[PDB]
Design an enzyme around this catalytic site. Structure first.
Site, PDB file in Angstrom:
ATOM      1  CG  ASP A 117      -0.410   0.053   2.499  1.00 18.43           C
ATOM      2  OD1 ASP A 117      -1.177   0.173   3.481  1.00 18.43           O
ATOM      3  OD2 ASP A 117       0.831  -0.028   2.597  1.00 18.43           O
ATOM      4  CD1 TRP A 164       1.466   8.772   9.333  1.00 23.39           C
ATOM      5  CD2 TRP A 164       0.251   6.894   9.477  1.00 23.39           C
ATOM      6  NE1 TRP A 164       1.233   8.527  10.666  1.00 23.39           N
ATOM      7  CE2 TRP A 164       0.491   7.380  10.783  1.00 23.39           C
ATOM      8  CE3 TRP A 164      -0.494   5.716   9.319  1.00 23.39           C
ATOM      9  CZ2 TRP A 164       0.010   6.729  11.925  1.00 23.39           C
ATOM     10  CZ3 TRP A 164      -0.971   5.070  10.453  1.00 23.39           C
ATOM     11  CH2 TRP A 164      -0.717   5.579  11.739  1.00 23.39           C
ATOM     12  CB  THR A 216       3.716  -4.913   2.837  1.00 19.73           C
ATOM     13  OG1 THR A 216       3.556  -4.414   1.507  1.00 19.73           O
ATOM     14  CG2 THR A 216       4.831  -5.988   2.841  1.00 19.73           C
ATOM     15  CG  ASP A 235       5.112  -2.940   5.376  1.00 22.06           C
ATOM     16  OD1 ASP A 235       4.369  -3.606   6.135  1.00 22.06           O
ATOM     17  OD2 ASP A 235       4.804  -1.814   4.937  1.00 22.06           O
TER      18      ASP A 235
HETATM   19  O1  LIG Z   1       3.340   5.921  11.738  1.00 20.94           O
HETATM   20  C1  LIG Z   1       3.269   5.287  10.672  1.00 20.94           C
HETATM   21  N1  LIG Z   1       3.802   5.792   9.443  1.00 20.94           N
HETATM   22  C2  LIG Z   1       3.763   5.130   8.170  1.00 20.94           C
HETATM   23  N2  LIG Z   1       3.184   3.919   8.060  1.00 20.94           N
HETATM   24  C3  LIG Z   1       2.647   3.365   9.202  1.00 20.94           C
HETATM   25  C4  LIG Z   1       1.975   2.094   9.360  1.00 20.94           C
HETATM   26  C5  LIG Z   1       1.675   0.969   8.183  1.00 20.94           C
HETATM   27  N3  LIG Z   1       0.830  -0.086   8.757  1.00 20.94           N
HETATM   28  C6  LIG Z   1       1.544  -1.375   8.914  1.00 20.94           C
HETATM   29  C7  LIG Z   1       1.955  -1.454  10.434  1.00 20.94           C
HETATM   30  O2  LIG Z   1       0.932  -1.196  11.418  1.00 20.94           O
HETATM   31  C8  LIG Z   1       2.667  -1.297   7.852  1.00 20.94           C
HETATM   32  O3  LIG Z   1       2.331  -1.998   6.610  1.00 20.94           O
HETATM   33  C9  LIG Z   1       2.913   0.252   7.588  1.00 20.94           C
HETATM   34  O4  LIG Z   1       3.109   0.589   6.185  1.00 20.94           O
HETATM   35  C10 LIG Z   1       1.619   1.984  10.663  1.00 20.94           C
HETATM   36  N4  LIG Z   1       2.032   3.145  11.403  1.00 20.94           N
HETATM   37  C11 LIG Z   1       2.654   3.949  10.441  1.00 20.94           C
HETATM   38 CA   LIG Z   2       2.385  -1.131   4.364  1.00 22.65          CA
END
Ligand SMILES: O=c1[nH]cnc2c([C@@H]3N[C@H](CO)[C@@H](O)[C@H]3O)c[nH]c12
Ligand SMILES: [Ca+2]
Ligand SMILES: O=c1[nH]cnc2c([C@@H]3N[C@H](CO)[C@@H](O)[C@H]3O)c[nH]c12
Ligand SMILES: [Ca+2]
Lengths: 316, 314
Positions: free
Chosen positions: B10, B83, B137, B248
């Protein structure tokens, strides 16, 4: 025939692009020092990024080393936590962490940690043989201190103070529930210091307010052009920083120091609102008799600036 | 011999580091495709970054091009806009905009723009001569969709689904007024799809939940080590992304080498209602419920070295 320049910045992304612009143009600029203020950054990160950038340039283009100091200045009105630097983010970038460069920085880091930024500014200007141009891309707290503490002994040694700050005939960028949006962040951070600076007689000032900086938004297509120069260390650096609305506020300001063709200027008597009003921090035209003039930038040459930055980034 | 792998991501930073890991380890992984979901990014940017990374690598080492598809999956609970923009930032990075590479991307962009992510996933798995390992991921909406549409015809062709998501014995990371913090984001984004995937029989699943990914935090001293490899485009790329946990990346590292972690079979269910623990991955005692192999005590140093070494592929 380069002129002496000192960069007084507060460590955000455009402050560092401004640094590159100044340092890369050795024909026009001899950068003799820099100080970082804990405003739109966390001073230690900003301090370290400044040194890492200086060392990378020293080892790759023969840029002479210079003193770097942290200012003790404190905010009247703090910058938003969010913006307070990707300087932490820049400190870990690969381009700023090449062993040879990081090793040199660690070698001279200790002595620079010893300087008091404000005193450093005062000493570099006063002790320099020729006059010094001060490029201010953060708040005016440091220049004000020098004026309050050394007066004419300081100001008489300043060629000109090129300032990124204010908004004269356009809206500002400080939008909080308690403000009316007429002030700009650098001034709003410390209004009293700004007032001291703009009302100082005998100090030549060039002001890059939002009136001129608004004409240079940071756009993706242009930023991607640094991708055409990945063989140049400075393009990886500048492109990466801009890759992360946003304008090249500080960069435009520094570009003027490099070449005054960047923009024409027009004299305006500038006062600053220090009272706690919705327009606190606003830079306004005053009617006071015998009030000193500030040369406000107008109609900046956008194309010229953009091409200058892309070219400067090919220095090494 | 390398194994067929499809990356279902993603577009956030670790998604891209994971992509670099899979793509650089040609001895172990044959990356036959990727799909991007408009979750932890805006699909268009995720799409373009994926392509630019792929073309940057294809023009600097032996790595065959593969199809990249945009998934039409839509959120049940969207990621914070904050994000999602990171893909936009990477899209403008200089290392991803070298002319020869962008021109290559511009050249093959038309063929890829026509794929439907979810359908491309179904097709790559089902038309492959050998079985395919899916590295997920992002959310599980795409795998669920394939299961929902093809059932056994799809699952029988999956070597294994290696998933980054959930939290079993530890706390989640979805902290919101409406939640109790037991849920992890990838699952929370689309609980129903996750439930379909984790309860699917005849689908082997490896799960990297927060229980394991919490033990590999992204640290500065380590990130600065990429500065020792600036002569490598991949090091400039990876170091830049981590400078601005390796969730990931750990998951993709496993796909490259299972020595990254041992796994334990656990029957995993997902909370789907709109309650505070919506999206939580919970252990279940239901009879004959399918098992998921949850990763444990990942080899941190082994993983950090693999990534450093991988970033020197070009
Ligand atoms: O603080 C953050 N910044 C960027 N991406 C994530 C994520 C995203 N979610 C997943 C982990 O919870 C992982 O695939 C990641 O891309 C969780 N927390 C953050
Ligand atoms: Ca991800
Ligand atoms: O959104 C923002 N992020 C980071 N810095 C600034 C600034 C800082 N203040 C000045 C322009 O208001 C300029 O010196 C810049 O570094 C204004 N807005 C932002
Ligand atoms: Ca600034």
């Amino acid at each position: 025939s380069a002129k002496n320049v000192v960069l007084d910045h507060d460590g955000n992304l455009d402050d560092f692009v401004a640094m590159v612009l100044l340092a890369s143009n050795t024909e026009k600029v001899r950068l003799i020092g820099a100080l970082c203020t804990d405003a739109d950054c966390f001073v230690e990160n900003g301090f370290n990024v400044t040194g890492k950038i200086m060392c990378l340039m020293h080892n790759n283009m023969n840029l002479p080393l210079f003193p770097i100091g942290k200012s003790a200045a404190t905010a009247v009105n703090p910058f938003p936590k969010e913006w307070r630097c990707l300087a932490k983010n820049m400190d870990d970038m690969p381009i700023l962490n090449i062993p040879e460069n990081v090793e040199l920085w660690d070698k001279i880091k200790a002595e620079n940690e010893k300087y008091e930024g404000q005193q450093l500014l005062a000493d570099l200007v006063m002790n320099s043989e020729e006059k010094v141009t001060i490029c201010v891309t953060g708040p005016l707290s440091n220049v004000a201190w020098c004026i309050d503490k050394y007066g004419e002994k300081f100001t008489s040694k300043v060629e000109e103070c090129v300032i990124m700050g204010g908004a004269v005939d356009v809206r500002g960028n400080v939008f909080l529930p308690s403000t009316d949006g007429t002030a700009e962040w650098n001034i709003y951070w410390d209004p009293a210091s700004a007032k001291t600076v703009f009302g100082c007689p005998g100090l030549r000032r060039i002001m890059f307010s939002l009136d001129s900086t608004n004409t240079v938004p940071v756009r993706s297509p242009y930023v991607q052009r640094f991708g055409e120069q990945t063989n140049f260390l400075l393009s990886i650096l500048v492109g990466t920083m801009w890759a992360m609305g946003y304008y090249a506020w500080d960069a435009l300001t520094a570009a003027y120091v490099v070449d005054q063709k960047v923009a024409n200027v027009d004299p305006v008597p500038i006062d600053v609102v220090v009272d706690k009003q919705p327009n606190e921090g606003a830079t306004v035209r005053t009617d006071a008799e015998n009030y000193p003039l500030t040369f406000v930038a107008r109609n900046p040459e956008a194309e010229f600036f953009l091409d200058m930055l892309l070219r400067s980034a090919r220095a090494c």
